[PDB]
Amino acid sequence: PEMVRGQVFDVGPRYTNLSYIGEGAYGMVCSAYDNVNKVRVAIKKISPFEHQTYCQRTLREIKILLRFRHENIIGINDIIRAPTIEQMKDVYIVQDLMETDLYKLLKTQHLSNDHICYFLYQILRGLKYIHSANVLHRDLKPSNLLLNTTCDLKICDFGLARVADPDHDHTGFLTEYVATRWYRAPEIMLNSKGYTKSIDIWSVGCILAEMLSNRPIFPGKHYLDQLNHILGILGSPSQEDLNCIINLKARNYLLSLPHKNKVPWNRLFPNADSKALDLLDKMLTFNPHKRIEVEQALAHPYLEQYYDPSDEPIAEAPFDDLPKEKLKELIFEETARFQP
Secondary structure, three states, rough: EEEOEEEEEOOOOOOOEEEEEEEEEEEEEEEEEOOOOOOEEEEEEOOOOOHHHHHHOOOOOOOHHOOOOOOOOOOOOOOOOOOOOOOOOEEEEEEEOOOEEHHHHHHOOOOEEEEEEHHHHHHHHHHHHHOOEEEEEEOOOHHEEEEEOOOOOOEEEOOOOOEEEEHHHOOOOOOOOOOOOHHHOOHHHHEEEEOHHHHHHHHHHHHHHHHHHHHOOOOOOOOOHHHHHOOOOHHHOHHHHHHOOHHHHHHHHHHHHOOOOOOOHHHHHHOHHHHHHHHHHHOOOOOOOOOOHHHHHOHHHHHHOOOOOOHHHOOOOOOOOOOOOHHHHHHHHHHHHOOO
């Protein structure tokens, strides 16, 4: 088997000429040459089978990405694994090689308004499909938005995704959460399990803000610091908005805080397109019920040059406690179609 940084990376014979890219989650990412399609591709080695949790996230990713087919969502081209459950210790997932991602882009490159607009359009176009399938991504952030050399944008990393479940969204105050802190909606820290579509729209709002200044808008250093970042910009929540939070610990926390007034978007972002700031405002709404939905966002004046609902497709086919062993069989079965 081919080696990379001394670790077996065994993707032959179709895939040759490997280069290291990084770690991923439970393994290593490399580029390689696809001898059938004559293009370089990205391959991730995943070794999840020892842990319930890794198996859950790996199955989720595979099931979702194989069901989805959309220009703004990364596809699985191929999956390499052993012919038998017994011999299968790793799985390799093959995707189109994407030169960069929005995280790497934002740390080095000023974005034109035109790029910001095109990027936001493509993000919402893919999210419309995701949401149409009753799925929540739940970990949207710059590093999960991949881009190629012509700025085609594709959403990746569905490991934390869930089926939407708004009737079971409510929880207590300071309930632990898995998704990346700077892109977490305020309600996660107050009374929400992250089981409604509005969680994703908050994250997209945060990404829009970041695209306008090259810095995260709410860089919290820990669980509750994240809420305090948000309220420093949006200002204190309205009585009406507090009235939607029945949980007393959560409501009383917000009541304990000194009054804070709104920071106007046009002061945070003096060179931003005004339509962009109008849409930002509607995405970064404190109250999840009042927050703009994906289709409304696509229809906003900011995106009018791209908006075409007939060319923004929806999914044909909308969508734990299992042990390691059964999850491994599920992953084996789910990957069978790529075997010769």
